[PDB]
Every structure is written in structure tokens, then in C-alpha cells.
Amino acid sequence: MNIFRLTGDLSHLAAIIILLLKIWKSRSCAGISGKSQLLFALVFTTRYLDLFTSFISLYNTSMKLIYIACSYATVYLIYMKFKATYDGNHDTFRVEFLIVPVGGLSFLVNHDFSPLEILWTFSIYLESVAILPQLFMISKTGEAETITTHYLFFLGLYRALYLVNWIWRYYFEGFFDLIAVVAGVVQTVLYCDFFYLYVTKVL
Numbered sequence: 065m066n067i068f069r070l071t072g073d074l075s076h077l078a079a080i081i082i083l084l085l086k087i088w089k090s091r092s093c094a095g096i097s098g099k100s101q102l103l104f105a106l107v108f109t110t111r112y113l114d115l116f117t118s119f120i121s122l123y124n125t126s127m128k129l130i131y132i133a134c135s136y137a138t139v140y141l142i143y144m145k146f147k148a149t150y151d152g153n154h155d156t157f158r159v160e161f162l163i164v165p166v167g168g169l170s171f172l173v174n175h176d177f178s179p180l181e182i183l184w185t186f187s188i189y190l191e192s193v194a195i196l197p198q199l200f201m202i203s204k205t206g207e208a209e210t211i212t213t214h215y216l217f218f219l220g221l222y223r224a225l226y227l228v229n230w231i232w233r234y235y236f237e238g239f240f241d242l243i244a245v246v247a248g249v250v251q252t253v254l255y256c257d258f259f260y261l262y263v264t265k266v267l
């Protein structure tokens with residue numbers, strides 16, 4: 065554990081809280097793709113399955129439980145409460161063409177053919193493309209009412225801090241993860257497309 069994975073996770077957490085609090089106060093999830101939020105909740109579900117097998121630290125367990133509870137609550141706030149503001153007519157990305165290749169990719173490319181390692185690799189590959197339904201929604205409508213600039217800021221700071229996390233990890237520990245780094249580059253390119261679409265079409 066280093067400071068850039070630490071702050072990157074906190075930056076990742078800050079954005080999730082911003083979106084969860086924005087939907088709650090505005091009583092609205094218009095412009096948000098619940099399919100994307102469902103995928104990010106599936107990411108935390110398959111990434112943190114090690115809670116039923118391995119308790120590492122109180123901080124480590126709390127972050128997992130907070131990540132899971134926060135994105136689960138966002139999904140509840142989109143599909144049950146405030147569902148009258150869910151723009152389901154535009155959140156129409158056929159995500160089966162996404163989880164099936166990602167699932168097959170995690171089945172074939174992993175660090176170990178172990179159940180928990182396969183589902184961790186799935187979460188890493190799924191998290192890299194989970195933003196695709198939301199990008200499909202924004203490009204179609206050109207609108208994203210619930211999306212605020214500072215929500216993007218902590219999304220970019222999160223990916224940018226994991227950029228430093230990869231570098232500090234290699235130079236000070238000799239650790240390098242081809243699977244996570246490659247998927248992270250895919251996630252970063254798509255997240256810049258998120259930021260570019262917001263500036264050019266929304267803001």
C-alpha cells in the first residue's frame with residue numbers, strides 16, 4: 065500500500081459520494097445511465113468477493129463495504145426511488161455485448177485459474193469498459209443533468225493517481241501487473257472521452 069493508491073481510492077470514493085449525494089438531494093437521476101452504475105456495482109461485487117474468505121484490515125474491509133454500499137445505494141436510487149427521473153429511453157446500451165467478451169477475456173487471460181482470481185480479473189476488465197453505456201447515453205442526447213464538474217474531477221484525479229500508483233509501485237517494489245495496467249489504460253482513454261464529451265456537449 066502506498067499514498068497514490070490510497071488517495072486514488074479516496075478520490076474514487078469522493079466521486080461516488082458526490083454522485084450519490086447529488087441524486088439524493090436533487091431527487092433526480094436524469095442523465096445518469098443506470099446500466100453503467102449497475103456495472104460498477106457488479107465490479108465491486110466481483111472484486112470484493114474476498115470479504116467472505118479473507119479479512120485483511122479494518123481500513124481495507126471498511127473501504128470495500130463502503131464501496132459496495134455506496135454504489136448499491138446509487139443503483140437503488142436509480143431503479144426504485146427516483147425511477148421516474150431515470151432516462152431509460154436513452155440508457156439503451158445492449159450490455160450483453162460487453163459482459164460476455166469481458167467474461168470470456170477474464171476466463172482466458174488471468175494471473176491464475178482460480179475462482180477468486182477469475183472474478184477479480186473480471187472486475188478489472190469490466191471496470192475498464194463499465195463507462196461505455198454512460199458514454200453512449202451522453203453522445204446520443206448531448207445532455208447529462210445530474211453529472212457535475214467536480215464529479216468528473218475526482219474521476220480524473222482517481223485515474224491520474226492510479227497512473228502514479230503504477231509507477232511508484234514498479235520503481236519502489238518491482239511490482240508490475242500487465243492485466244491491471246492494460247485494462248487501466250483502456251479505462252483512462254474512455255474516461256477522457258467521458259471528460260471530452262462533457263466539456264464539448266454537456267458543459
Ligand SMILES: CCCCCCCC/C=C\CCCCCCCC(=O)OC[C@H](O)CO
Nearest residue numbers: 065066067068069070071228232233236237
Ligand atoms: C510500510 C511502508 C509503506 C510505504 C508507503 C509510502 C508511500 C509514499 C509516501 C510518501 C512519499 C511522498 C512523495 C512526495 C510526493 C510529492 C508530490 C508532488 O511533488 O506533487 C507535485 C504537485 O502536484 C505539483 O508539482
Ligand SMILES: CCCCCCCC/C=C\CCCCCCCC(=O)OC[C@H](O)CO
Nearest residue numbers: 193196197199200201202203204205246250
Ligand atoms: C449515439 C451513440 C453513442 C455511442 C458512443 C460510444 C458508445 C460505445 C459503443 C461502442 C464502442 C466500441 C467499444 C469501444 C471500447 C471497447 C474496445 C476495447 O477496449 O478493446 C480492448 C482493446 O481495444 C484491446 O486491448
